[PDB]
Every structure is written in structure tokens, then in C-alpha cells.
Write a protein that binds this ligand. Structure first.
Ligand SMILES: Nc1nc2c(ncn2[C@@H]2O[C@H](COP(=O)(O)O)[C@@H](O)[C@H]2O)c(=O)[nH]1
Ligand SMILES: Nc1nc2c(ncn2[C@@H]2O[C@H](COP(=O)(O)O)[C@@H](O)[C@H]2O)c(=O)[nH]1
Lengths: 227, 227
């Protein structure tokens, strides 16, 4: 759904594709316009976060589905922040889908396809070569990002249910937000109806993906999607 | 605007009045229904906060403009939390009115009429007999309260611009949220128009106070004010 194209030692192109994949590629489909929507939503979110002084890999746009991003020494992590009980959290806590958490939960996953992205804790993270100090910074950033996105979206009648972030290290040694921020990598629910406006629509055939993703875009920008 | 009536060693009545005062009582007016609205908005806010496990002095209602509250050993503080630049903050930061702060600011004021509520820091607070540990707890509670109120109001198209909290100590030695939480003690702006829906309307004759306060009530409860 994304292709990384190197430019040089300090930057690269992140290209967003219309291809969608779930359940280890056993489920595949192409959604005309998905790439554009995810790229554009990523821009909006990265820029919103940067306004608050969050460091992100975003540099500029290089076309509708193409972002220029700074090259990083990437942490082998998926960092997940959860506000509302959904998906895999139902397997860890005796709480129903939709349950509003008293505080946001941060989970750490070892980014590794062969092991199917297993959950880790701070000890495992050290073995993987990530210091406790780094993990503390990463979680602090993640929670700050969580609050900005959650509040921004809440004003637009969208629940930030949960989402995945990735991080890397820049030349200075600063920790920098990377990958993407889109309905591919977040759970968004309509505040009134609780319907999914994200990749779960595709994962579980709950409706029309392109329609859900256009909805998010329209609510954020006020504009019907261009392309 | 409030009268404290002692009952006994552990509780008292906080009575909300229709009288309004600004600029050290040099500016005065009576707004029919103001007391009821502030009393009722206080109930709503205290209960909302208690649902999140914030300890407050609120015990019960004893009439439209009367609350039963627990007797506390009061800290001589006004604790102000600020999300958006307004009022006196324009005298401290080179930032325009309406500027959205990256993070909430907590200011401490020594509650003292003669000295006109001067700003203090942690060192002054110690001389006034408040330990650094207490101040830390107070500020932690204040920021938690800020987040709950801000998010709750934002969903209703109301910007929590800033607000004043007061705190006391109960029998157990726990730190308890006290005084009131109303358009008298908060800055609320309409999200779309940025107009004041609070005591600033009276302070600076920017419109109809009772109209602004009813607006807050209506938006929160969905009901036009009873009395
Ligand atoms: N696109 C994508 N999103 C993920 C991945 N892992 C977790 N997430 C996101 O993180 C959240 C939690 O996922 P869960 O662990 O409940 O399946 C969801 O918003 C989900 O979309 C992944 O490998 N790819
Ligand atoms: N009613 C009232 N509100 C106050 C007082 N002190 C601070 N506040 C509130 O706290 C915020 C900050 O006030 P400022 O420092 O800008 O005068 C405003 O919302 C203001 O109404 C006070 O003594 N009385």
C-alpha cells in the first residue's frame, strides 16, 4: 500500500498505492483513489502535529500520492495507542467493544512479519537494542500525538479508537515520527453511529472503503475529494 | 456572588447569588437567574469530574442555587489553567489573543484581595506553607481537570480558553477540588465565532450575560433553562 523510493542519504519518496491488503496478503483489493486519500490525510495529520512541535519525517508533497520524507534509522516497532476497546485489545482485557478507557493505553509491537508483529514489553525492547530512555521518549511522543489527533477528530464527530505509529532516529539522534497516519493505520468511528471509517470496512467487509475514506477527508477539509 | 454557610465540622452550604462583581467591586450588577445557572453548571461539572475519579467538595444539591459541600482546609491559592491566550497571559507572553498554546499552562496565584491575587511560583508557595509535593499534586489534578473539561466542551462547540480552580485538604489529608466551576470562573468561547460565553461579557460589556450563560447551559444539557 506504500512504496519507499530512495533519493539519497537524507531523504526519500513515500508513494501511496491504491492496493489494499489484509490477513497477510490472503485478502487483496484495489480501491481507486485510496492512495491519494491516504497520502493527503497523512499530510494533514503530519502538518497538524508539527504545528504542536512534534518532529515528523514529513518534508513536502511530490504529487497527489507521493510524500518526500527524511531518511531515518527506523525503530523495529509498531507503537499502538488505544482510547476505546477494539480489535486485539478484546483478547487482553475483559471489556466490551466500544468501552471507553479511563486513560490511553500504549502497546509496543516488534515489527517482524515472520513472527506476525508480536507484542513486547520494555525488557524485550532492550534486547532488540532500544534503551529504556528511548522507549520512554517514544511513549511520551505517542501520547502527545494521541491527544492532538483525538481532540482534533472529536470536534469533527470522529472517535480516534486506536492507531499505530512508527518512529525512527535522525542524524541529530532525535526521535522522529515516521510511516503514515491514515484510515489504513487508525481506527476511526463516527461519534453518533459508531460505524467504522477506516480499513476495518475492508478487513471485515462492513461497507464501501472508498466511501468511508472520502467521508473522513470531507469531514476534515470540508471539501469533497479531488484526486 | 457566592455565600458560604457553615453547617458543621465536615460540611457547609455554598449559595450562589444573582449579584455580579468586577474590578474590585467598582463594577456591579444583578443578573436574574445567574445564581441558578452557576450553581447548576457547577453541579454538572463536579459530577462529570467525579465520574473520572477526581475528588471534589461537591456533596449534593440543597435547592436551585445551593450546594452542600464538604468542609476543607483550604489552600490560599487560585490555580489557573490556560489553553488559549487571553486576559492577563497577554501581559506575559508575546502572543496574540486567541493563540492556541502547544501545551496547557498552569499558573499559581496567592489568593489575597489586599495584594490583588498576585502570581507566585513554587518558592513563594513554600513560604506560604505549601510543600512542593502538594503543589505537584495540585498541578497534576488541575491538568487532569483541564483535559476532561476541555474535551467535553469541545464536542459542544465550546473552547475552554482558561479557568480558575481552588483546592482544599480533607480529613484524610487528600487534596480536594473546591469553590465553583462556572462561566464566572472560566473563559468559554464559541468555537465558530470566538465570542465570550462567560463573565467577560459583563466585565467588558460585550453583550448579554444571562443570554451567554443560558447558551452554555443549553448546549451542555440540551434543555432551555428552568429556574
Ligand atoms: N495498516 C496497519 N495498521 C495496523 C497494523 N498493526 C496495527 N495497526 C493499527 O493499530 C490499531 C490496533 O490494531 P489491532 O491490534 O487491534 O488489530 C488499529 O488501528 C490498526 O489499524 C499493521 O500492521 N498495519
Ligand atoms: N470570577 C473570577 N474568575 C477568576 C479569578 N481569578 C482568575 N479567574 C479566571 O481564571 C482565568 C484567568 O484570569 P486572568 O489571569 O486572565 O485574569 C479567567 O477565566 C478568569 O475568569 C477571580 O478572582 N474571580
Amino acid at each position: 500500500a506504500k512504496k519507499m523510493i530512495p533519493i539519497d542519504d537524507d531523504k526519500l519518496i513515500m508513494e501511496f498505492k491504491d492496493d489494499a491488503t489484509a490477513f497477510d496478503g490472503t485478502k487483496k483489493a484495489r480501491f481507486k483513489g485510496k492512495g491519494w486519500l491516504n497520502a493527503q490525510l497523512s499530510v494533514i495529520f503530519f502538518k497538524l502535529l508539527e504545528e504542536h512541535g512534534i518532529k515528523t519525517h514529513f518534508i513536502g508533497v511530490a504529487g497527489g500520492n507521493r510524500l518526500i520524507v527524511e531518511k531515518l534509522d527506523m525503530y523495529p516497532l509498531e507503537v499502538v495507542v488505544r482510547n476505546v476497546v477494539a480489535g486485539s485489545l478484546k483478547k487482553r482485557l475483559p471489556l466490551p467493544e466500544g468501552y471507553e478507557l479511563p486513560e490511553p493505553i500504549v502497546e509496543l509491537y516488534y515489527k517482524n512479519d515472520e513472527l506476525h508483529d508480536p507484542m513486547i514489553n520494555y525488557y524485550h525492547a532492550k534486547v532488540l537494542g532500544i534503551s529504556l530512555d528511548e522507549i520512554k521518549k517514544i511513549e511520551e511522543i505517542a501520547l502527545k500525538v494521541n491527544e492532538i489527533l483525538k481532540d482534533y477528530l472529536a470536534k469533527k464527530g470522529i472517535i480516534l479508537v486506536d492507531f499505530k505509529l512508527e518512529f525512527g532516529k535522525d542524524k541529530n539522534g532525535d526521535i522522529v515520527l515516521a510511516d503514515e497516519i491514515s484510515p489504513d493505520t487508525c481506527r476511526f468511528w463516527d461519534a453518533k453511529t459508531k460505524r467504522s471509517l477506516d480499513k476495518d470496512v475492508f478487513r471485515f467487509d462492513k461497507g464501501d472503503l472508498i466511501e468511508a475514506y472520502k467521508e473522513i477527508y470531507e469531514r476534515i477539509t470540508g471539501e469533497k475529494p479531488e484526486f
